[PDB]
Design a protein around this ligand. Structure first.
Ligand SMILES: O[C@H](c1cc(C(F)(F)F)nc2c(C(F)(F)F)cccc12)[C@@H]1CCCCN1
Ligand SMILES: [Mg+2]
Ligand SMILES: [Mg+2]
Ligand SMILES: [Mg+2]
Ligand SMILES: [Mg+2]
Ligand SMILES: [Mg+2]
Lengths: 201, 146, 185, 51, 60, 180
RNA sequence: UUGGAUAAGGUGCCUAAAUAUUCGCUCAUGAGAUCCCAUAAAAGGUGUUGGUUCAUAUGAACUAGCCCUGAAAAUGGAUGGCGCUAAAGCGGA
């Protein structure tokens, strides 16, 4: 957490754990961009999750619902809320930490060209037994009225093509570099070359 | 009775689970006082615990471990179930399995890492210099290509 | 926990079986069927040189074994479908008013008219890739057919639902379409 | 006008079942338990009343 | 049948009860086998429900 | 030597006898193996058992011998049969369980965990009545029988337990549980 | 006052300290979460997990763990919150 800004790819993660991971980092002093928040997984069965959400929604302020619990139903929003929950947001430091976090659905403008990081101690594949029921967050959101899910998916798909295109180019570049290295290893100095070989490069 | 051409099929039939925990599997201990160390599966205690032995080439004594603390390598050497440590040592040396492991990508990378760890400052500097030289040469080549 | 549990599913003669990651795809005489199994931990494998496919499950309680068995059964069903269409015979029994069954839109969308004499039209559309035919032998029965053992069954169920009456004695009013025979073409 | 075989078939579905003595669920005629969670899967089953 | 009856009865007591079949002969404080043995050597006199065991103690 | 894996249950042979009295010059000596964490605990256990069985209490007897028995072949897999007496919240039960292990002590340790986990039986409530090595022809429990298989082989589906050095919260590329 | 080392308790984050290790057990369409303490019962359960006693690898009967039912009140809502299921639950070591 000594980087300028960590971009976290939220696909295949387990919600609460991910949030927890984020929160500590934020507290420490790290700018976090939680990206691709539609594919965050919850450890409960989908129906159960939905029920829970419904229950949460039901707890509103009786006198004037303009105040009280704002039931933000965007997956990113939900994630943000979760993060906040795990923070001392009522102080100043906590507030600052919260501010530092930025959440995104899918991938927007700058966070497509930035390196996407994964939290391995929070992954669904590493935290759930494969005979247990899990729930995609996007789906849950859709169920409790988010609407912009299909659109998001489409956008993601579109982005994927672009990424693939870029990836091909990158691969080509890498290959070229390798070739160059191969060529030039004979053009250096013997002892130096040997040394290089010894140290892996 | 022979297979004639079915043998080939058997050889090249994709199996999802390569590397089984079984007697004579190589094994890299990941967690504990011993880590990064190699050690062979002698017997197996239960569904979770196994007895390993790092043949006196390696530093790790015969001991029980949780399988969870082991990462199976692609290497195996056929051994009798009740094989004692001396026998294991004899066999592995004969088969040159350690050499094979070293040759393999993972082993190579491990060794590289070790080298990096153990290097003197000067050696690091030498490496840097070499890299710089390569870059220069590489850059020149790139320019030429352009 | 049981270390190794296996099930052998013998493939028929004229079946093109193709698996990858529990996503099984079978091609035959009466269409192609694709059905994923990536919701249980199973390393199902092909044997293209000979016959059969082997479903194996490592560790896991009796639940796991049960799951494996189910998977095997499903596979078998699929194979059967590919070889030969799954024929679901559905006989409609009426006490007074004859049930008017009308097939349209390429043997899909079976329209049920004049059930118990309500003068309304009951619409029930078949699932993807399932043909609904009428009687060539007797007078009442309706054939629900088309490769997938599951889809056809579902369609049949839907049809039944569409038929069945509401707030009256069900033991007296036996009116409706019912699955007579589960067979193959 | 219900020909005997057809009638029998109809019965097979509509009549020859069991019923939960607790939540009234229609069960298969050979069931040992309720299957429904609300009765807590009771074994208290009765046959569907005929006529 | 007896066990069943007991169980039925239990449904009416409060708290936790348990039906317990005994190795005794019946109300008498002797194991079945023991009782049989006693009968064989005639060291036991049966009255009504309860039975007395000859202890080798009284006068002739 | 590993200090995270070890379970500190040892086996102690204890011998003790009631103090001799003018009226009972030649008392009876009692011996037992006791599975306990330290020597003092073992002694205590022995005393308790004496109390339970005979008329004897620590106050009117003396420990004659305490040995501490180490496994003779601590690297030979063995199939252990165990007999237990345990107390539930509802009453008392006898039971027999089997554990495949490398030492008696290890087996005992396993057993304690099992009882804790499966029956919620706490260490206090259990009395080990006999552990003996069972030949493979007399294995009655399926989870041990299976192991006793001929050329036994299984894959490794367990999740990697990385060292808290190479454990990092930020990862480059999504790790793989598949391995091989 | 300074430094140390603990106690009760904890160690996912809030929250200082383990997403520690180790062996089990739990999936809940109103889970569970630690003295006092802020509740739950009789009775069930072909849910699963162990057992015991019997009979001829099935059929019984039981038994106890967890889990489910039994389980309904009024502002909205409270294992303290967020959350958590290869637990961050329960029982251990
Ligand atoms: O903490 C639960 C909960 C809340 C919220 C949130 F507030 F973010 F919408 N989301 C939950 C989710 C979510 F849908 F994954 F976000 C799952 C399970 C419980 C949730 C609720 C809160 C009221 C009482 C218990 N259920
Ligand atoms: Mg101080
Ligand atoms: Mg300290
Ligand atoms: Mg902290
Ligand atoms: Mg939640
Ligand atoms: Mg806590």
């Amino acid at each position: 957490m000594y980087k300028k800004e960590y971009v976290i790819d939220c696909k295949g993660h387990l919600l609460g754990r991910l949030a927890s991971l984020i929160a500590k980092e934020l507290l420490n002093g790290q700018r976090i961009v939680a990206v691709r928040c539609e594919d965050i997984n919850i450890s409960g069965s989908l129906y159960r999750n939905k029920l829970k959400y419904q229950e949460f929604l039901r707890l509103r302020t009786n006198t004037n619902p303009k105040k009280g619990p704002l039931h933000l139903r965007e997956p990113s929003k939900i994630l943000w809320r979760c993060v906040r929950g795990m923070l001392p947001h009522k102080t100043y430091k906590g507030q600052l930490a919260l501010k530092k976090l930025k959440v995104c659905v899918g991938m927007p403008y700058p966070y497509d060209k930035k390196k996407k990081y994964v939290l391995p101690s929070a992954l669904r594949a590493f935290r759930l037994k494969k005979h247990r029921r899990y729930c995609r967050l996007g789906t849950l959101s859709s169920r409790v009225g988010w609407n912009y899910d299909t659109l998001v998916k489409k956008n993601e798909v579109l982005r994927k093509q672009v990424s693939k295109a870029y990836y091909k180019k990158k691969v080509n570049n890498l290959n070229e570099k390798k070739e160059i290295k191969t060529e030039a290893l004979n053009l250096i100095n013997p002892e130096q070359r040997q040394v290089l070989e010894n140290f892996g490069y | 009775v022979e297979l004639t051409e079915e043998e080939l099929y058997i050889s090249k039939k994709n199996l999802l689970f390569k590397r089984f925990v079984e007697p004579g599997r190589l094994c890299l201990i990941e967690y504990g006082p011993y880590a990064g160390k190699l050690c062979f599966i002698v017997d197996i205690v239960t569904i979770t615990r196994v007895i390993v032995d790092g043949a006196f080439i390696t530093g790790v004594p015969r001991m029980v471990i949780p399988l969870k603390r082991l990462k199976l390598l692609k290497e195996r050497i056929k051994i009798n179930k009740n094989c004692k440590s001396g026998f294991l040592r004899k066999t592995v040396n004969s088969t040159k399995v350690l050499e094979e492991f070293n040759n393999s990508k993972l082993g190579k990378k491990m060794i590289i890492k070790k080298k990096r760890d153990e290097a003197t400052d000067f050696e690091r500097f030498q490496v840097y210099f070499a890299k710089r030289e390569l870059k220069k040469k590489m850059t020149t080549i790139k320019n030429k290509k352009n | 926990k049981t270390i190794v549990s296996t099930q052998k599913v013998l493939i028929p003669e004229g079946v093109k079986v193709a698996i990858n990651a529990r996503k099984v795809t079978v091609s035959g005489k009466y269409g192609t069927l694709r059905r994923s199994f990536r919701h249980l931990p199973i390393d199902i494998r092909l044997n293209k040189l000979k016959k059969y496919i082997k479903v194996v499950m490592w560790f896991g309680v009796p639940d796991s074994l049960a799951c494996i068995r189910t998977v095997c059964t499903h596979l078998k069903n699929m194979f059967t479908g590919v070889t030969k269409k799954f024929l679901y015979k559905m006989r409609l029994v009426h006490a007074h008013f004859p049930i008017n069954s009308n097939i349209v839109d390429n043997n899909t969308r079976i329209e049920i008219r004049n059930y118990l004499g309500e003068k309304s039209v009951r619409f029930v559309k078949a699932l993807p890739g399932v043909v609904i035919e009428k009687s060539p032998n007797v007078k009442d029965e309706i054939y629900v057919s088309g490769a997938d053992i599951e889809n056809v069954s579902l369609t049949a169920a839907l049809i039944h639902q569409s038929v069945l009456c509401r707030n009256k004695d069900i033991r007296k009013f036996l009116d409706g379409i019912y699955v007579s025979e589960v067979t193959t073409v | 006008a219900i020909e005997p075989s057809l009638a029998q078939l109809a019965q097979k579905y509509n009549c020859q079942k069991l019923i939960c003595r607790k939540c009234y669920a229609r069960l298969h005629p050979r069931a040992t338990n309720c299957r429904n969670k609300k009765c807590g899967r009771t074994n208290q089953l009765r046959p569907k009343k005929k006529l | 049948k007896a066990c069943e009856a007991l169980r039925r009865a239990k449904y009416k007591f409060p708290g936790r009860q348990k039906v317990f079949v005994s190795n005794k002969w019946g109300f008498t404080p002797f194991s079945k086998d023991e009782y049989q043995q006693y009968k064989k050597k005639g060291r036991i006199i049966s009255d009504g429900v309860s039975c007395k065991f000859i202890r080798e103690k009284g006068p002739l | 030597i590993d200090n995270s894996l070890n379970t500190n249950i040892h086996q102690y042979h204890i011998v003790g006898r009631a103090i001799p009295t003018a009226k009972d010059k030649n008392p009876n000596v009692y011996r037992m193996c006791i599975f306990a964490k330290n020597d003092t605990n073992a002694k205590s256990r022995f005393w308790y058992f004496m109390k339970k069985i005979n008329k004897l209490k620590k106050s009117n007897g003396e420990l004659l011998a305490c040995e501490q028995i180490k496994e003779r072949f601590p690297l030979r897999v063995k199939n252990y049969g165990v007999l237990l007496r345990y107390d539930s919240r509802t009453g008392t039960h006898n039971m027999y369980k089997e554990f495949r292990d490398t030492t008696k002590e290890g087996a005992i340790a396993q057993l304690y965990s099992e009882m804790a986990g499966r029956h919620r039986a706490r260490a206090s409530s259990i009395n080990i009545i006999r552990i003996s090595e069972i030949s493979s022809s007399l294995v009655r429990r399926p989870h041990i029988k299976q192991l006793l298989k001929r050329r036994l082989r299984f894959p490794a589906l367990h999740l990697p337990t990385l060292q808290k050095e190479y454990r990092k919260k930020f990862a480059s590329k999504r790790p793989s549980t598949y391995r091989m």
